[PDB]
Structure 1
Amino acid sequence: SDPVRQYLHEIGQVPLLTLEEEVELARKVEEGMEAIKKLSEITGLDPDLIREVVRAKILGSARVRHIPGLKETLDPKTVEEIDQKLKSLPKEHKRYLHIAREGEAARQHLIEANLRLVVSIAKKYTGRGLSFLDLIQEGNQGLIRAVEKFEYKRRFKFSTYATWWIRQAINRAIADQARTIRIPVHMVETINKLSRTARQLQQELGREPTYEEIAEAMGPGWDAKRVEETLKIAQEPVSLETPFYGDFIPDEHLPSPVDAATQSLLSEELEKALSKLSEREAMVLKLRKGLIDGREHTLEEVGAFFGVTRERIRQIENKALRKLKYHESRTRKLRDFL
């Protein structure tokens, strides 16, 4: 009924590796890796594709899917064709298939046997934007990285190499998925830097540092302006359901009744001017002011719709406006329309 306690129990089912079986699994994995290189040379296929089909068979028929990066979809049909093209080899080649298989199975037990290491690393990154489990799954992602990069011949214990990728994968998640407004991971580093800097100052000043004091400590290129701007974009959004805070926010987008009224009375009292003018006069104005396309076409582009050049259009326009200006002060409708 408690997801953490459940996962902590499942993890305890897999026993921790001895230094021997640690080296044995890490060894079988690296050999299987090479057995798929040497296996793509022989068969003349894609390495990635081969290593996926080796996975399909070790994991079981429960998993089968199109791995984006691969070129041929991974339906039970095409894996059986590649599992036969594999079984089709001489004893001296077909031996590399048993290696890759033995490797993918060792890879699994090596990942599972180290899931405890990831827990006791994620336990320290609690409350930075992500839930304990979200931290664990992110850490388990770096552990899958550490397994395919672990050089066992360096005589280092596996925990010493995985810890780097695990921290790397958790620290990346916090920086990538903890803000409702996603911030580029380098900008997060700087925002954090301003934070650690400001707290340092506050703890040797007995008061909160002004923007100037921060720009000073931040170093060269930092003025008070960029400190303020960096905080402006470092502001996380507030909830509308905060006890409700949303109830006091007027909707500005959708026009009110008064606006819809006046906008539908401006168009009415304007097509009172498409008449008194004409048909082409009351159209050069539509292109110039953008009534048709939304964009203002110069007396240049407009010249390509009536034939006229950039100086009969001007008189075509100014005849319209000057005539419409006399239709004002006689109807006096459009004045208040501000």
Structure 2
Amino acid sequence: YTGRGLSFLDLIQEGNQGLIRAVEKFEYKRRFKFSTYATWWIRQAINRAIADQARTIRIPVHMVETINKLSRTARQLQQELGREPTYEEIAEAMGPGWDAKRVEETLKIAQEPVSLETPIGDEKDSFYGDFIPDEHLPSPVDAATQSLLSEELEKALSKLSEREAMVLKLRKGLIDGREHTLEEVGAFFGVTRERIRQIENKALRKLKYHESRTRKLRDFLD
């Protein structure tokens, strides 16, 4: 079983677990030799361990069996046709319920991750991770434009009334971080929901009027 993702000693230890199970479940009344019944369990344990531990991104056992069967079918068709089969042939040979789309999805699933320390060039000084940008943390430009938008929005909300600005900054989650509902803002102010939506609409219209008269906030909309 060597060369299938697990080292020799790991296979040996997994087979040892299978052998322990075989000893537990062996019956000598049947007059069969121990190797005959123990081989089943040892191979079972080794194959289960290969299915469970040979991939960095673990794949369920049924899916591993599907991938192995698909690879066997592809190899058989490749040796029979004298060329690399397309997904249609492979799907047809797999059987009912298989089309080219499912074969492609299974092959995409079966793609092992590539090491970040794999060398690029002939010197081997450069690696994959040296060419992969980090797209999680915002760039300085993104943080700067977010701060600019916050400043301009704070300046724009100044022209509004004292209460209307608060209503919009609460409904849009500019204070607590999360949007509030009309009933919640009412419980904060003691006012019913209809008046809150009316005043929010009026203040939004006023902000639109100020933006039209100034045009100092349109660029941030992208």
Same fold, TM-score > 0.5, yes or no:
yes
Question: Which of 144, 148, 151 is the equivalent residue of 2:27?
Answer: 151
Q: CA deviation at 1:129?
A: 0.2
Q: CA deviation at 1:221?
A: 1.6
Q: CA deviation at 1:331?
A: 3.4
Q: Distance in 1 between matches of 2:176 and 2:22?
A: 57
Q: Deviations over 1:112-164 (max 9, x none)?
A: xxxxxxxxxxxxx0000000011101111111111111112121111111111
Q: CA deviation at 1:290?
A: 3.7
Distance 1:295 1:187, change over 3 A: farther
Question: Which of 185, 202, 212 is the equivalent residue of 1:329?
Answer: 212
Q: Distance in 2 between matches of 1:144 and 1:127?
A: 24
More off after superposition, 172-181 vs 285-294: 285-294
Distance 1:302 1:204, change over 3 A: farther
Alignment of 1:1-338 (within 5 A): 125-243=1-119, 244-292=127-175, 296-299=179-182, 302-338=185-221
Distance 1:198 1:301, change over 3 A: farther
Q: Secondary structure at the match of 1:152?
A: coil
Q: Distance in 1 between matches of 2:163 and 2:104?
A: 54
Q: Distance in 1 between matches of 2:57 and 2:23?
A: 33
Q: Distance in 1 between matches of 2:204 and 2:25?
A: 75
Q: CA deviation at 1:296?
A: 4.4
Distance 1:286 1:153, change over 3 A: farther
Distance 1:219 1:279, change over 3 A: farther
Q: Deviations over 1:168-199 (max 9, x none)?
A: 11101110011111111111111111111111
Q: Deviations over 1:247-272 (max 9, x none)?
A: 11111111111111111111111111
- TM-score, normalised to structure 2's length? 0.87
Q: Which structure carries more relative contact order (alpha carbon 8 Å, separation 6+)?
A: 1
Q: Secondary structure at the match of 1:197?
A: helix
Q: CA deviation at 1:326?
A: 1.8
Q: Deviations over 1:75-117 (max 9, x none)?
A: xxxxxxxxxxxxxxxxxxxxxxxxxxxxxxxxxxxxxxxxxxx
- TM-score, normalised to structure 1's length? 0.59
Distance 1:310 1:216, change over 3 A: farther
Q: Distance in 2 between matches of 1:212 and 1:283?
A: 62
Q: CA deviation at 1:316?
A: 1.9
Q: Distance in 2 between matches of 1:235 and 1:206?
A: 24
Q: Deviations over 1:215-269 (max 9, x none)?
A: 2122222121111111111111111111112111111111111111111111111
Distance 1:239 1:331, change over 3 A: same
Distance 1:201 1:252, change over 3 A: same
Question: Which residue of 1 is the match for residue 122 of structure 2?
Answer: none
Q: Distance in 2 between matches of 1:144 and 1:170?
A: 13
Distance 1:280 1:216, change over 3 A: farther
Q: Deviations over 1:288-326 (max 9, x none)?
A: 434456554454555544444442222122112111112
Q: Distance in 1 between matches of 2:207 and 2:26?
A: 81
Distance 1:297 1:209, change over 3 A: farther
Q: Secondary structure at the match of 2:81?
A: coil
Q: Distance in 1 between matches of 2:176 and 2:79?
A: 60
Q: CA deviation at 1:330?
A: 3.4
Q: CA deviation at 1:280?
A: 3.6
What are structure 2's unaligned runs of at least 5 residues?
Answer: 120-126
Q: CA deviation at 1:282?
A: 2.5
Q: Deviations over 1:19-43 (max 9, x none)?
A: xxxxxxxxxxxxxxxxxxxxxxxxx
More off after superposition, 129-138 vs 251-260: 251-260
Report % sequence identity.
100
Q: CA RMSD in A?
A: 2.0
Aligned residue pairs, count: 214
Distance 1:162 1:261, change over 3 A: same
Q: Secondary structure at the match of 1:294?
A: coil
